[PDB]
Amino acid sequence: TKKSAAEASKKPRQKRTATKAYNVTQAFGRRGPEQTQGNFGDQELIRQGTDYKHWPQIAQFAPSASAFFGMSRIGMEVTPSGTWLTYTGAIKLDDKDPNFKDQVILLNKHIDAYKTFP
């Protein structure tokens, strides 16, 4: 059985897994433009999280823990709200992957799509 929102929400934010039972908004907040918000997901992905039909083709771009700390620029920022570990980086698509073109289409479908929402 799928974990309830009550149970899944007990994980620290960065270790949460969105599903139909605990969706992207519930886990990670509303998509939005601010520096603190995520901007990724169309309505279907938002509602289904890792249950989304094309989730594996998105997750193939998410970094391992080793790669996350190995590839990114990591910083620390202390503010009246708290202490933050900051990260930035870039992941290259493999243009020799037979599914390259579909990967671009899939990613374009989800980037900043919240701007079109009712």
Question: Residues binding Na ion: what is the number (CB under 5 A)?
Answer: 6
Whole-angstrom Cα distance, residue 104 to residue 118?
25
Q: Which stretch binds Na ion (CB under 5 A): 16-24, 43-51, 80-88, 107-115?
A: 43-51
Whole-angstrom Cα distance, residue 96 to residue 40?
25
The tokens for 95 are 């243009």
Q: Contacts with a copy of itself in 4-23 (CB under 8 A)?
A: 12-18
The tokens for 66 are 């080793």
User: CB of 81: closest distance to a copy of itself in angstroms?
Assistant: 7
Whole-angstrom Cα distance, residue 36 to residue 22?
20
* Residue 52 binding partner per list Na ion, a copy of itself, none, with a CB distance cut-off of 5 to 8 Å that depends on partner kind: Na ion
- Reduced to 3 states (helix: H, G, I; strand: E, B; else coil), residue 40 is strand
Q: Does 113 bind a copy of itself (CB under 8 A)?
A: no
User: Which residues form the interface with a copy of itself (CB under 8 A)?
Assistant: 12-18, 24, 27-28, 35-41, 49-50, 58-77, 81-95, 100, 104, 107-108, 110-111
